[PDB]
Amino acid sequence: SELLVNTKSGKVMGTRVPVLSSHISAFLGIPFAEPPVGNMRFRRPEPKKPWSGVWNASTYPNNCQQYVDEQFPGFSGSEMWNPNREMSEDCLYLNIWVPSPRPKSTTVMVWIYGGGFYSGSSTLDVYNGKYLAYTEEVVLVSLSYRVGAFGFLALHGSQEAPGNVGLLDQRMALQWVHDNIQFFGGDPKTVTIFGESAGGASVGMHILSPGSRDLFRRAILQSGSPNCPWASVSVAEGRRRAVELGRNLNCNLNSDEELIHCLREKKPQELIDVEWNVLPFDSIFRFSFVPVIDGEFFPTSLESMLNSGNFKKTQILLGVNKDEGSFFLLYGAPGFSKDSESKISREDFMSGVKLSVPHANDLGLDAVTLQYTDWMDDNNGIKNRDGLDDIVGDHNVICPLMHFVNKYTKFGNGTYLYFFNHRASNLVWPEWMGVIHGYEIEFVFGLPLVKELNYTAEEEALSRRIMHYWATFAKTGNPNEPHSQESKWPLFTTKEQKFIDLNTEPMKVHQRLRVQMCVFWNQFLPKLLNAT
Amino acid sequence: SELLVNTKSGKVMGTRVPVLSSHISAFLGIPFAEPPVGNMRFRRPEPKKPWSGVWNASTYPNNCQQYVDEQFPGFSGSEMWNPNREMSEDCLYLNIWVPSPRPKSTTVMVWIYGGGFYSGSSTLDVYNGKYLAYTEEVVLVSLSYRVGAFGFLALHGSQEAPGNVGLLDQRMALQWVHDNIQFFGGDPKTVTIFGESAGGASVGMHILSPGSRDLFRRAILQSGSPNCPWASVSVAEGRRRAVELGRNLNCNLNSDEELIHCLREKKPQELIDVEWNVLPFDSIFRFSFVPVIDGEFFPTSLESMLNSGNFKKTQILLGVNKDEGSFFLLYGAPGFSKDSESKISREDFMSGVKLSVPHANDLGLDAVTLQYTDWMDDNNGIKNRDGLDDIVGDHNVICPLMHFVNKYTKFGNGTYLYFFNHRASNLVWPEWMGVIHGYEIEFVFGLPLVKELNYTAEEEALSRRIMHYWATFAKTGNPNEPHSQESKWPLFTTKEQKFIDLNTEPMKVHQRLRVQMCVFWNQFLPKLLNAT
Ligand SMILES: CCC1=C[C@@H]2Cc3nc4cc(Cl)ccc4c(N)c3[C@H](C1)C2
Ligand SMILES: CCC1=C[C@@H]2Cc3nc4cc(Cl)ccc4c(N)c3[C@H](C1)C2
Ligand SMILES: *[C@@H]1O[C@H](CO)[C@@H](O)[C@H](O)[C@H]1NC(C)=O
Ligand SMILES: *[C@@H]1O[C@H](CO)[C@@H](O)[C@H](O)[C@H]1NC(C)=O
Ligand SMILES: *[C@@H]1O[C@H](CO)[C@@H](O)[C@H](O)[C@H]1NC(C)=O
Ligand SMILES: *[C@@H]1O[C@H](CO)[C@@H](O)[C@H](O)[C@H]1NC(C)=O
């Protein structure tokens, strides 16, 4: 049977699913680790014990325990990201979509969901892998990993809660794909990992970490980089936040052993209820439990690893969206609202800068303000709103990604960079937010091909072009079909630094993506904060 | 006789001079102070002892002792600024041009020449007052004052070389105009002082100094402000430079008395020969002997005087030229030449920034570089050259003037601001220099009306418009003729900050002159240098 597959862990039975007037196979909810429960909370994951009999893989698994967005009850724009299955600490599973008839040895793509390391699910409608598996004939895998305190509480030095276990969850799933994907028709030697937001930062972290490098061939990073300011903390800050978490739950703080034991007795929701109380500053785009520079998963600081070429050398495809910051401002900065144009007063602009660069002294805040203020028209509410949008986006996503791409390209074997700036015609979010953090995903997964979703014919064409770029890149290390007649996406080089836009217009090549602002964020400001 | 005038100091006999196919009277070289020679070198000036008989005022007086420009031997562009009469320490004289027939009580304009406080003459062709006196029917006066060490050597605390004596020379001439101009047909109650460069900074210094305020009615400042970074030094820096000067001349440095005595025995040229050796930094647009914040001529710091409204309140007319910096770069920055387009390499750009902001630490230099660099095209030699031109001009002339105008306007009775950007058609300097520091003067003095000088008809029209704005402002406190039909030069207000361009095109009103760069130079950079 096409739906029965014998793996090294046991047999699994999939289900046949319809997709664009055809069908493919889906193996949903396959376990790749022992449930990280009880005394296992906060610990490194354990390989799943093999099972006898047939594992029913016809339905989605539970989603990991996480903060749930209730800012706009009943609004699809936000609820489409919330867990759509029951939440449970028993959540370490993966899903595989396989072309029918089953391939023999074809290209594999493994998706790592984003969510600031505090949320995310592999079961979201926007992550349905059937369109991509079917359309590009690839075996599509989506893994899962612990988020929040469950995946990143870090008390360095202890082996009960070492930190980074969420990253090790991802690695175990990559190990399982390496060991078993051949039985589903996939080529374990041609696996591409790709992810968005924290998922994109994660991809970069597997490129850096010696322990993950051998488990994949190529990588794709969307709106996220390993070196992002929100993606990691020192072991000292991680410890401080773990202790403060315990303090919020009235735990004994005498020893790591005492703290961990207390935290392990709490119910999932008790930890989630006070999770946000441990941040050190009043800020936006900062999350409580994230990866830690431990000296193990990451041998040394991320910057020295990038400088020395201490990372996997291969081809990478990566990029960002036009208005990465709007989402965060809507949710956490004064003056921004879902139902108004959100024109910003000079007073709220100033409040916003402060929330955006939480780690800056007054001279630093003045430097940022001057860089983004048009002093010939300083009370223009639209410029203030858009200036703040760029500040958040440049500081948190674009400039860190540009620094990573320039450092990687020096030692890598091929880089392809994009700038996604198409605003979907059926977007439910207000116009002021523009091209939002996370909204290129639906085009990567081919949702515009589904007629009932209401995209335009041009949007379907764009989605097809993107899916083919991604899949062709996974298969060959180049998004372009060599002998084709279509416009070519040039290679990004240290010298020319070329990139392309991704929208419904005719391809256009540019150079030095937001270079002026990124020299400010990557060279000047850091130097100013260190001097002062 | 129209050419004989009885003043409180004695009788003077002028000469009749032709001007634009007509005639007026000129009284050249009238003494207003005792010769500041011998043991008087470095001392405050003394009123001229009255004389019996008739003082011959038919020819120009000597020019004060000064550094002479020999950078382009035989080139008119530079020699037109050099002393055109014999140099001598006996140089405290003034010149008066009087309409014929002699007025009874008409508007008076007193010109104060510029030259970085180290050079200048009242006898230059470009300062010939006959065109303005004749055309606008004003009594035009040009005074003189000591420059270099002779006018500004400062050993605070000593009464032999107190500092600021060059400014007191200007004041004595203003006192003489106040006391005697009535006899030449001028109204001592309607005297306007105007000057360019250090002359413009001087005008502002008389507005500030309690001891000078009562001696004039209104003021005009061209390309210079009292608060300019090159216009004054602290008493400590003044002292340090006076001692270093003595050190260059192998003087006894045991006491002020010993130093001054030695300096007084040296010949004028010995002091001029080592004058430039006392600057504290490798720089451009910095001069050795300038006014000192002494607590006497200037009661407190210039900034606190501006902030408290401690200054003469009246109307002022002032402005700047488009490319104030080109002159200084040509003469002192690597990569700039008179006979080439001077495209600047990134290496010379960096050298240039360093010479332009001599007082900056590395973080400050990086801030300036980022502010003026286009990172999408950083090796464009024309942008590097022009960026450097703006840096020198904004830092040294424009932004200091904009700060002064914004502080003055709060307490003043009327402000009119201009931006002169017309490049003369007969300019002998290369095109890359643009509209040069000092080249609006020829239009203020009406040289374009002289056919043989070869300006265009449009340039003659522009000169006439400027002469009429200046003279009408001196006469009424407003450059506009109220009931006229011509385009109106609006008042600069704290709120609207309007200004006009001065060129051959139809008047155009703008707002917030170089506001973006000036917030950088007046608020951010100073704050960065103080924090670091
Ligand atoms: C950084 C957090 C995060 C990042 C990814 C992109 C993302 N984008 C969102 C945009 C809006 Cl406006 C509202 C809700 C959103 C959301 N829950 C997500 C999720 C969560 C995935
Ligand atoms: C700051 C020194 C100074 C300022 C005023 C304007 C001025 N401008 C000059 C421009 C050039 Cl290119 C060459 C020579 C110039 C010169 N000796 C002067 C004199 C000297 C008067
Ligand atoms: C689990 O597999 C069985 C087949 O053995 C199927 O009938 C069932 O619907 C699947 N999912 C459920 C109901 O939990
Ligand atoms: C990638 O590596 C191959 C073989 O090692 C080399 O021939 C090729 O030029 C490289 N490509 C790039 C873009 O560096
Ligand atoms: C000085 O005045 C006399 C008239 O008394 C005149 O002849 C002479 O030319 C003037 N200047 C000179 C020659 O120095
Ligand atoms: C100048 O002062 C007069 C009288 O003191 C006043 O009426 C007038 O409004 C003032 N003009 C300005 C521009 O301040």
JSON list of C-alpha atoms in Angstrom, two decimals, chain A residues 53-124:
[
{"chain": "A", "resi": 53, "resn": "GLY", "atom": "CA", "xyz": [2.21, -2.39, 15.12]},
{"chain": "A", "resi": 54, "resn": "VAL", "atom": "CA", "xyz": [1.08, 0.43, 12.87]},
{"chain": "A", "resi": 55, "resn": "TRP", "atom": "CA", "xyz": [1.20, 4.09, 13.93]},
{"chain": "A", "resi": 56, "resn": "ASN", "atom": "CA", "xyz": [-1.98, 5.89, 12.74]},
{"chain": "A", "resi": 57, "resn": "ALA", "atom": "CA", "xyz": [-0.63, 8.95, 10.85]},
{"chain": "A", "resi": 58, "resn": "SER", "atom": "CA", "xyz": [-3.91, 10.21, 9.39]},
{"chain": "A", "resi": 59, "resn": "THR", "atom": "CA", "xyz": [-4.46, 13.28, 11.62]},
{"chain": "A", "resi": 60, "resn": "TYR", "atom": "CA", "xyz": [-2.51, 16.32, 12.90]},
{"chain": "A", "resi": 61, "resn": "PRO", "atom": "CA", "xyz": [-0.75, 16.11, 16.27]},
{"chain": "A", "resi": 62, "resn": "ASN", "atom": "CA", "xyz": [-1.17, 18.40, 19.30]},
{"chain": "A", "resi": 63, "resn": "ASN", "atom": "CA", "xyz": [0.59, 21.81, 19.25]},
{"chain": "A", "resi": 64, "resn": "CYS", "atom": "CA", "xyz": [3.15, 22.65, 21.94]},
{"chain": "A", "resi": 65, "resn": "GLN", "atom": "CA", "xyz": [2.10, 24.67, 25.04]},
{"chain": "A", "resi": 66, "resn": "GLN", "atom": "CA", "xyz": [2.13, 28.40, 24.21]},
{"chain": "A", "resi": 67, "resn": "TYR", "atom": "CA", "xyz": [0.89, 31.97, 24.78]},
{"chain": "A", "resi": 68, "resn": "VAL", "atom": "CA", "xyz": [-2.29, 32.42, 22.71]},
{"chain": "A", "resi": 69, "resn": "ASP", "atom": "CA", "xyz": [-3.12, 35.68, 20.91]},
{"chain": "A", "resi": 70, "resn": "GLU", "atom": "CA", "xyz": [-6.48, 37.12, 22.10]},
{"chain": "A", "resi": 71, "resn": "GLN", "atom": "CA", "xyz": [-5.86, 40.73, 21.07]},
{"chain": "A", "resi": 72, "resn": "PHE", "atom": "CA", "xyz": [-8.59, 40.54, 18.36]},
{"chain": "A", "resi": 73, "resn": "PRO", "atom": "CA", "xyz": [-11.10, 37.80, 19.36]},
{"chain": "A", "resi": 74, "resn": "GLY", "atom": "CA", "xyz": [-12.71, 36.29, 16.28]},
{"chain": "A", "resi": 75, "resn": "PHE", "atom": "CA", "xyz": [-10.46, 38.16, 13.84]},
{"chain": "A", "resi": 76, "resn": "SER", "atom": "CA", "xyz": [-8.92, 35.77, 11.30]},
{"chain": "A", "resi": 77, "resn": "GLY", "atom": "CA", "xyz": [-5.88, 37.98, 10.74]},
{"chain": "A", "resi": 78, "resn": "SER", "atom": "CA", "xyz": [-4.61, 37.03, 14.17]},
{"chain": "A", "resi": 79, "resn": "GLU", "atom": "CA", "xyz": [-6.36, 33.73, 14.92]},
{"chain": "A", "resi": 80, "resn": "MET", "atom": "CA", "xyz": [-4.90, 32.08, 11.80]},
{"chain": "A", "resi": 81, "resn": "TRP", "atom": "CA", "xyz": [-1.63, 31.94, 13.75]},
{"chain": "A", "resi": 82, "resn": "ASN", "atom": "CA", "xyz": [-3.01, 30.49, 17.01]},
{"chain": "A", "resi": 83, "resn": "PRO", "atom": "CA", "xyz": [-2.77, 26.78, 17.79]},
{"chain": "A", "resi": 84, "resn": "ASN", "atom": "CA", "xyz": [-5.58, 25.04, 15.84]},
{"chain": "A", "resi": 85, "resn": "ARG", "atom": "CA", "xyz": [-5.22, 21.73, 17.70]},
{"chain": "A", "resi": 86, "resn": "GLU", "atom": "CA", "xyz": [-5.28, 20.96, 21.42]},
{"chain": "A", "resi": 87, "resn": "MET", "atom": "CA", "xyz": [-2.15, 22.18, 23.22]},
{"chain": "A", "resi": 88, "resn": "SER", "atom": "CA", "xyz": [-0.01, 19.70, 25.15]},
{"chain": "A", "resi": 89, "resn": "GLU", "atom": "CA", "xyz": [3.56, 19.24, 26.35]},
{"chain": "A", "resi": 90, "resn": "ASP", "atom": "CA", "xyz": [3.35, 15.95, 24.40]},
{"chain": "A", "resi": 91, "resn": "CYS", "atom": "CA", "xyz": [3.98, 17.70, 21.11]},
{"chain": "A", "resi": 92, "resn": "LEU", "atom": "CA", "xyz": [7.15, 16.49, 19.45]},
{"chain": "A", "resi": 93, "resn": "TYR", "atom": "CA", "xyz": [5.87, 15.28, 16.05]},
{"chain": "A", "resi": 94, "resn": "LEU", "atom": "CA", "xyz": [6.45, 15.82, 12.32]},
{"chain": "A", "resi": 95, "resn": "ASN", "atom": "CA", "xyz": [4.33, 15.71, 9.13]},
{"chain": "A", "resi": 96, "resn": "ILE", "atom": "CA", "xyz": [5.24, 14.51, 5.62]},
{"chain": "A", "resi": 97, "resn": "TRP", "atom": "CA", "xyz": [3.44, 15.17, 2.33]},
{"chain": "A", "resi": 98, "resn": "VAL", "atom": "CA", "xyz": [4.40, 12.73, -0.44]},
{"chain": "A", "resi": 99, "resn": "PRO", "atom": "CA", "xyz": [3.70, 12.87, -4.18]},
{"chain": "A", "resi": 100, "resn": "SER", "atom": "CA", "xyz": [1.55, 10.07, -5.62]},
{"chain": "A", "resi": 101, "resn": "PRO", "atom": "CA", "xyz": [2.81, 7.77, -6.92]},
{"chain": "A", "resi": 102, "resn": "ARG", "atom": "CA", "xyz": [5.52, 7.66, -4.25]},
{"chain": "A", "resi": 103, "resn": "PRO", "atom": "CA", "xyz": [8.94, 8.94, -5.45]},
{"chain": "A", "resi": 104, "resn": "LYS", "atom": "CA", "xyz": [12.13, 6.88, -5.27]},
{"chain": "A", "resi": 105, "resn": "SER", "atom": "CA", "xyz": [14.66, 9.53, -4.33]},
{"chain": "A", "resi": 106, "resn": "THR", "atom": "CA", "xyz": [13.50, 13.08, -4.70]},
{"chain": "A", "resi": 107, "resn": "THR", "atom": "CA", "xyz": [14.30, 16.49, -3.21]},
{"chain": "A", "resi": 108, "resn": "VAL", "atom": "CA", "xyz": [13.25, 17.05, 0.44]},
{"chain": "A", "resi": 109, "resn": "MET", "atom": "CA", "xyz": [12.22, 20.36, 2.10]},
{"chain": "A", "resi": 110, "resn": "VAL", "atom": "CA", "xyz": [11.89, 20.61, 5.89]},
{"chain": "A", "resi": 111, "resn": "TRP", "atom": "CA", "xyz": [9.88, 23.57, 7.30]},
{"chain": "A", "resi": 112, "resn": "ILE", "atom": "CA", "xyz": [10.67, 25.13, 10.68]},
{"chain": "A", "resi": 113, "resn": "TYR", "atom": "CA", "xyz": [7.86, 27.42, 11.94]},
{"chain": "A", "resi": 114, "resn": "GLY", "atom": "CA", "xyz": [8.49, 30.84, 13.43]},
{"chain": "A", "resi": 115, "resn": "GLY", "atom": "CA", "xyz": [6.88, 32.66, 16.31]},
{"chain": "A", "resi": 116, "resn": "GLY", "atom": "CA", "xyz": [9.64, 34.50, 18.23]},
{"chain": "A", "resi": 117, "resn": "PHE", "atom": "CA", "xyz": [10.57, 31.23, 19.98]},
{"chain": "A", "resi": 118, "resn": "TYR", "atom": "CA", "xyz": [7.48, 31.75, 22.16]},
{"chain": "A", "resi": 119, "resn": "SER", "atom": "CA", "xyz": [4.77, 30.40, 19.83]},
{"chain": "A", "resi": 120, "resn": "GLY", "atom": "CA", "xyz": [4.12, 28.46, 16.64]},
{"chain": "A", "resi": 121, "resn": "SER", "atom": "CA", "xyz": [2.48, 25.28, 15.27]},
{"chain": "A", "resi": 122, "resn": "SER", "atom": "CA", "xyz": [3.22, 22.98, 12.34]},
{"chain": "A", "resi": 123, "resn": "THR", "atom": "CA", "xyz": [-0.51, 22.51, 11.72]},
{"chain": "A", "resi": 124, "resn": "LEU", "atom": "CA", "xyz": [-1.54, 25.99, 10.59]}
]
